[PDB]
């Protein structure tokens, strides 16, 4: 379109279509994935006419760690480890926090506990893991029925509610993400200091969550394919 | 949840309580955690989590942490193998746990079981009784005696077996392999007085000649039990010479081609030699120690095919204990340092990672340019190792530098190995440069950071891609910083290594600015802009930063 | 675009576009 | 001669059945391997005998029987060594038998987590398969090349060798799945692999270049039906080492 005569190329690609394509490539983020293409499109438009303080650091870490991503999690865990202990819990408990950081955070924090020192990161990540585990168990039906792959025999009272809870995308993706963090805590809980052992008020919620996670994985096999 | 108790034969090392011993425990603890993750059999771990190694060794009680068993697990056990082996519990543990020296496991009364079985088995092998069953009953005694808890149980077993030895035919094979180690285990718990020692020595010495290989391996476990005793001189001057001749005869032949030979035979022979060198250093012959170290070196200098991985780790972890044991003569200890460096330079990550552990214990046991020939092996292993090796070599390197050198002697190498086009892992080297510069800021030595930043800034602007030159400088100005909130961002810089978006330029400008506001006199403040102006072409990050400095 | 780093075969680096 | 060798195979298999009873059929916690030590000593004498009798293919059979036993009994590192001894004894006379033995050694090294060792055995196989089986391969050797290609690419994405260990054969293999220049499509298939599996491997090798973890997660579920379970384990390790790198102590 640039090499051809302009009076033909302006008829092949109108300015309203060029502006639609430009806006779409930015809103989809495909402009950052294909920078050569976007540069050539804006060329075609031209041819057709600080102080680094605490709160700056918290804004910097937020730009990485309040996302959805799995790309740089060990580096992301080290960044939240330098957020002050009095800011950590509210930073992790926010809706926008990346739940994929919780296992890295427990693993990094355990390496401080096994070094003979207190870990504020381990304490915050453990409390957030347990609070989120209880917070999703509260959304299950109040009376549990056995999962049986052959027969959803109790439709209105129960299996309709599970078909709304599993397959939601937003909820289903959270369960094995939290289960990675809960497993990272449960594999260390016998090695931990006495006050960091499992709360006796959380033991039923933990069994309900574990059951619901294998039920969600089984539901995904039936309605879709092999889980990740 | 559980696997069988181990109580190993080797005591905690005192060398690790010293000032340099404590520093060795941190660095060799990093290398241990990675050897475990890479080659452990993981037999007591169900889940994928890499750093969950533990051993079934209770405080003679709660489990002793893997950190605190560092070179204590028995050499002839394969790494992470939790299966029953002849040798599970040491005689010093039978004595210390039962308060005998020459009953309830988990609510269960094991005294009742072991008492009942002694009564059955003694009456059933000493009546006219099936030969197919005698060996299986004596196997049962050899195993079940790990549960025995009163001295009269071992007395009854010793009497029963020494009767069975004169009752049963002299042409036997399938019994002897249980009878020898069971008799020696009993005799060893009974303390090797002259009333028991001469019978036991005569059984051990004669059964080392047995054609059946399990009868020899059983004799060698018998020897490992009796060597825990405070032996009488008249036994030590006669028994120890027979063991050392048997070891030098059978190891010196096989060492060049180990994989042709049975693994448990080589592993038990090494374990005897290491226990003899550590605990009987004056009594064992002058060619011993030296000759063992040489023929273990011939095993380590083999190929991935001729020396199996489990035997490689056994021989190495044994030699590594012998050097932190103070008991070597200096010519043996110095010969082991010469054997170590030639085995770091190999293909396989796990064989090299183990040889690195050995080199570290040598260098912290030796506490002037010869250390520099060692540090260049660590930098070479970052350059030519797989990522799983190089990331581990890069984690230990800051402490190795700080423990063996004045900073000035290695500051040239640290920055050059981060800048080199032959560096595959500049993001691993960034954390080394950081930990070296932040150490200099902790020791009040901040002037040396002003110097080495400015002395090297023109090497950084000669990085070939502009993304890799804008990066690297962002690592350098983060590593040099005195502001804690700037020194915190290095993981955010490391995660963005290939990138050149507007935020990657803005960060470079900010972190270079704050160094220019808070750490750079006019002669430096000008020369910094002069080295920058050479690359300040109209669109470059250096032009964008020169505007921020020049205002 | 992205291009291969020369110092490591598995590493890629950006070039201005 | 052959009767003595036969009797030693039966006397070895006696101890080996006795080991299988204690280890696999009874799962006995007290099963320290005295019969296995007797079986390995018995076959050690019998392999020496068959090689003095100058018949390598009959010694390699003992090595395959012992290698299979050590794998079943939970000792894959010892099995991988005996499979490579069988392969070396077969290779001057039976190249397909040797490739089959090296394929089992590579499976044993993968069981033992010895991924750099598995990578080297797959490269040896892919060389021998071109050398004896040829650019189109005969159908039996072609199935070996197809295994080695897919396994080597996933092992190279797992291990990521430095320039010092990116051998000519590794670089040559990987560039088929990669781009040479900023306007190259990536290479077209030589017809070695199914087109759908080849496009998914190119997509995987490209998603690891551009660090697209959402693409790797999508390609993992999409490739699951197309791979063997061993290759699905390799591809799981690539996604695992991508999200949680080894060697950091966390």
How far apart, in whole angstroms, are the C-alpha atoms of residue D13 and residue D10? 5
Partners of C7 on chain D (C-beta within 8 Å) are: 163
Half-sphere exposure of D100 toward its Cβ, with a 13 Å CA cutoff? 11
Q: Which of A64, A97, D208 is nearest to B491 (CA)?
A: A64
Q: What does the buried/exposed string (b/e) look like for A12-49 if buried means 16 or more CB atoms within 10 Å of the residue's CB?
A: eeeeeebeeebeebeeeeebeeebeebeebeebeeeee
Nearest chain C Cα distance for residue D179, angstroms? 9
**Which token pair is A40?**
């050539």
**Which token pair is D183?**
């306007």
Between B260, B263, B305, which is nearest D84 by CB?
Answer: B305
Partners of A32 on chain B (C-beta within 8 Å) are: 501
Cβ neighbours, 10 Å, residue B535: 17
How far apart, in whole angstroms, are the C-alpha atoms of residue B250 and residue B248? 6
Contact present, A185 and A126 (Cβ < 8 Å): yes
Query: What technique was this entry resolved by?
Result: cryo-EM
| Burial (CB count <10 Å: 0-12, 13-18, 19+), residue B196 | buried
Q: How far is CA D224 from CA B523, D197, D236, in A?
A: 64, 10, 10
Between B464, B499, B539, which is nearest C14 by CB?
Answer: B499
Return the residue of C nearest to A33 by Cα. C1
**Cβ–Cβ below 8 Å for D224 and A77:** no
Return the residue of B nearest to C16 by Cα. B500
For residue C4, list its beta bridge partners: C12
Q: What is chain D's Cα-based Rg? A: 21
| Interface membership of D163 toward C (CB under 8 Å) | yes
Q: How far is CA A76 from CA A40, A56, A60, in A?
A: 35, 16, 11
DSSP character for D22?
Answer: I
| Interface membership of C17 toward D (CB under 8 Å) | no
| Interface membership of C13 toward D (CB under 8 Å) | no
Give the list of residues 6+ apart from residue B58 with CB closer than 8 angstroms, or none: B5, B64
Give the list of residues 6+ apart from residue D45 with CB closer than 8 angstroms, or none: D8
How far apart, in whole angstroms, are the C-alpha atoms of residue D51 and residue D184? 55
**Cβ–Cβ below 8 Å for A52 and B514:** yes
How far apart, in whole angstroms, are the C-alpha atoms of residue D96 and residue D102? 10
Q: Scanning the structure block, which residue is given the tokens 């090294």?
A: D109
B196-203: Cβ within 8 A, 24+ apart: B196/B158, B197/B231, B197/B232, B197/B235, B198/B235, B199/B162, B200/B226, B201/B235, B201/B238, B201/B239, B203/B165
Nearest chain B Cα distance for residue A191, angstroms? 9
**Cβ–Cβ below 8 Å for D221 and A77:** no
Q: What does the buried/exposed string (b/e) look like for D77-105 if buried means 16 or more CB atoms within 10 Å of the residue's CB?
A: bbbbbbbbbbbbbbbeebbbbbbbbbbbb
**Cβ–Cβ below 8 Å for A39 and C1:** no
Contact present, B483 and B518 (Cβ < 8 Å): yes
Q: What does the buried/exposed string (b/e) look like for B472-506 if buried means 16 or more CB atoms within 10 Å of the residue's CB?
A: bbbbbbbbbbebebbbbbbbbbbbbbbebeeebbe
Query: What residues of chain C have any CB closer than 8 angstroms to a CB in chain B?
Result: 2-3, 5-8, 11-16
Strands C12-14 and C2-4: antiparallel
> CA angle B527-B530-B536, nearest 5°?
145
How far apart, in whole angstroms, are the C-alpha atoms of residue B139 and residue B211? 20
Residue B391 C-alpha from the chain's centroid: 18
**Which token pair is D57?**
């293919």
Contact present, B305 and B351 (Cβ < 8 Å): no
How far apart, in whole angstroms, are the C-alpha atoms of residue B67 and residue B26? 9
DSSP string, B483-509: -HHHHTTHHHHHTTTT--SHHHHHHHH
How far apart, in whole angstroms, are the C-alpha atoms of residue D117 and residue B344? 17
Contact present, D205 and D177 (Cβ < 8 Å): yes
Nearest chain A Cα distance for residue C10, angstroms? 16
Nearest chain B Cα distance for residue D120, angstroms? 11
Contact present, B308 and B259 (Cβ < 8 Å): yes
**Cβ–Cβ below 8 Å for C1 and D209:** no
Q: SS3 for C4? A: strand
| Interface membership of D221 toward A (CB under 8 Å) | yes
| Interface membership of A32 toward C (CB under 8 Å) | no
Cα dihedral sign, B502-B505-B508-B511 = negative
How far apart, in whole angstroms, are the C-alpha atoms of residue A122 and residue A103? 10
* Alpha helix stretches (DSSP H) within B168-280: 176-189, 194-207, 213-226, 233-254, 263-279
Q: What is chain A's Cα-based Rg? A: 25
Q: What is chain C's Cα-based Rg? A: 8
Q: What is chain B's Cα-based Rg? A: 30
Phi (first) and psi of residue B58, to 5 degrees: -80, 150
Give the list of residues 6+ apart from residue A184 with CB closer than 8 angstroms, or none: A102, A103, A106, A107, B49
């Amino acid at each position: 379109l640039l090499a051809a005569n302009l009076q033909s190329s302006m008829a092949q690609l109108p300015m309203e279509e060029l502006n639609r394509i430009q806006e779409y490539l930015q809103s989809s983020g495909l402009a950052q994935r294909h920078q050569r293409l976007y540069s050539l499109l804006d060329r075609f438009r031209l041819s057709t006419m600080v102080s680094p303080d605490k709160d700056w650091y918290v804004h910097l870490v937020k730009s990485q760690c309040w996302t959805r991503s799995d790309s740089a999690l060990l580096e992301g865990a080290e960044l939240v480890n330098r957020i002050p202990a009095e800011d950590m819990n509210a930073f992790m408990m926010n809706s926008e926090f990346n739940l994929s950081l919780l296992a890295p955070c427990l693993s990094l924090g355990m390496s401080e506990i096994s070094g003979g020192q207190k870990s504020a990161l381990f304490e915050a990540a453990r409390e957030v893991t347990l609070a989120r585990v209880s917070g999703t168990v509260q959304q299950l039906p109040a009376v549990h029925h056995v999962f049986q792959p052959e027969l959803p025999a109790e439709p209105a009272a129960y299996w309709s509610k599970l078909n709304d809870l599993f397959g939601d995308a937003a909820l289903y993706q959270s369960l094995p993400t939290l289960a990675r963090a809960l497993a990272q805590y449960l594999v260390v809980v016998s090695k931990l200091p006495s006050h960091l052992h499992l709360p006796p008020e959380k033991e039923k919620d933990i069994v309900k969550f574990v059951v619901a996670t294998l039920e969600a994985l089984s539901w995904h096999l039936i309605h879709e394919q092999i889980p990740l | 949840v559980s696997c069988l108790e181990q109580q190993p034969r080797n005591k905690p090392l005192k060398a690790l309580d010293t000032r340099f011993g404590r520093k060795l425990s941190i660095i060799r603890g990093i290398v241990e955690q990675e050897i475990q993750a890479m080659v452990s059999k993981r037999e007591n771990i169900a889940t994928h989590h890499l750093y969950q190694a533990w051993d079934p060794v209770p405080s003679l009680g709660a489990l002793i942490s893997h950190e605190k068993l560092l070179l204590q697990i028995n050499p002839e056990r394969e790494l992470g193998s939790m299966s029953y082996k002849l040798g599970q519990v040491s005689i010093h543990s039978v004595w210390l746990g039962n308060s005998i020296t020459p009953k309830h496991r988990a609510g269960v009364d094991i005294h009742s079981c072991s008492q009942f079985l002694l009564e059955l088995y003694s009456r059933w092998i000493l009546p006219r009784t099936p030969a197919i069953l005698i060996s299986e009953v004596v196997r049962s005694l050899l195993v079940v005696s790990d549960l025995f808890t009163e001295r009269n149980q071992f007395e009854l077993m010793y009497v029963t077996l020494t009767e069975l030895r004169r009752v049963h035919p002299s042409e036997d094979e399938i019994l002897a392999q249980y009878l020898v180690p069971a008799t020696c285990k009993a005799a060893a718990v009974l303390g090797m007085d002259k009333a028991v020692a001469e019978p036991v020595s005569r059984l051990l010495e004669s059964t080392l000649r047995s054609s059946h290989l399990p009868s020899r391996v059983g004799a060698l476990h018998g020897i490992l039990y009796v060597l825990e005793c405070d032996l009488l001189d008249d036994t030590a001057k006669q028994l120890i010479p027979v063991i050392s001749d048997y070891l030098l005869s059978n190891l010196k032949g096989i060492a060049h081609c180990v994989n042709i030979h049975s693994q448990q035979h080589v592993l038990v022979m090494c374990a005897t030699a290491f226990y003899l060198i550590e605990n009987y250093p004056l009594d064992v012959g002058p060619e011993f120690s030296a000759s063992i170290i040489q023929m273990c070196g011939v095993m380590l200098s083999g190929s991935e095919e001729s020396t199996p991985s489990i035997i490689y780790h056994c021989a190495l972890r044994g030699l590594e204990r012998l050097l932190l044991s103070e008991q070597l003569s200096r010519l043996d200890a110095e010969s082991l340092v010469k054997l170590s460096v030639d085995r770091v330079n190999v293909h396989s990550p796990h064989r090299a990672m183990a040889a690195l552990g050995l080199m570290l214990t040598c260098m912290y046991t030796g506490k002037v340019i010869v250390a520099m020939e060692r540090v260049s092996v660590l930098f070479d292993r970052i350059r030519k190792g797989f990522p799983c090796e190089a990331r581990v070599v890069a984690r230990i390197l800051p402490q190795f530098l700080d423990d063996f050198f004045p900073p000035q002697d290695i500051m040239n190498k640290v920055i050059g190995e981060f800048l080199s086009n032959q560096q595959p892992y500049p993001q691993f080297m960034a954390t080394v440069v950081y930990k070296v510069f932040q150490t200099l800021h902790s020791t009040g030595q901040s002037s040396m950071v002003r110097d080495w930043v400015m002395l090297s800034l023109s090497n950084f602007t000669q990085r070939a891609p502009v993304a890799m030159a804008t990066w690297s400088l962002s690592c350098f100005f983060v590593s040099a910083s005195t502001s804690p909130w700037v020194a915190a961002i290095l993981p955010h810089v490391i995660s963005r290594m290939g990138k050149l978006e507007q935020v990657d330029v803005n960060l470079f400008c900010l972190v270079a600015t704050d160094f220019y506001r808070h750490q750079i006199e006019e002669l430096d403040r000008r020369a910094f802009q002069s080295v920058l102006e050479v690359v300040a072409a109209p669109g470059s990050p250096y032009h964008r930063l020169l505007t921020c400095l020049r205002n | 675009y992205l291009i291969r780093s020369s110092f490591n075969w598995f590493v890629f680096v950006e070039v201005p576009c | 001669g052959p009767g003595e060798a036969l009797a030693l195979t039966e006397a070895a298999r006696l101890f080996l059945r006795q080991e299988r009873d204690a280890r696999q059929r009874l799962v006995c916690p007290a099963a320290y391997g005295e019969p296995l030590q007797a079986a390995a000593s018995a076959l050690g004498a019998a392999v020496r005998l068959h090689l003095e009798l100058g018949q390598p293919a009959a010694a390699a059979a003992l090595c395959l029987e012992l290698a299979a036993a050590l794998r079943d009994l939970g000792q894959p590192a010892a099995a991988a060594g005996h499979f490579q001894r069988a392969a070396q004894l077969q290779l001057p006379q039976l190249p397909l038998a040797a490739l089959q033995a090296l394929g089992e050694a590579a499976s044993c090294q993968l069981l033992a987590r010895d991924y750099t060792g598995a990578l080297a055995v797959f490269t040896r196989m892919q060389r021998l398969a071109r050398e004896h089986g040829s650019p189109a391969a005969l159908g039996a050797f072609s199935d070996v090349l197809v295994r080695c290609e897919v396994s080597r690419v996933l092992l190279l994405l797992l291990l990521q060798p430095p320039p010092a260990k990116l051998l000519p054969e590794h670089a040559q293999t990987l560039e088929k799945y990669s781009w040479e220049a900023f306007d190259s499509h990536g290479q077209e298939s030589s017809g070695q692999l199914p087109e759908e599996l080849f496009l998914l491997l190119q997509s995987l090798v490209m998603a690891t270049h551009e660090k697209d973890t959402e693409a790797i997660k999508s390609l993992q579920v999409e490739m699951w039906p197309l791979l063997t379970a061993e290759q699905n384990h390799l591809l799981h390790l690539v996604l695992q080492e991508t999200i949680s790198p080894s060697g950091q102590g966390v």
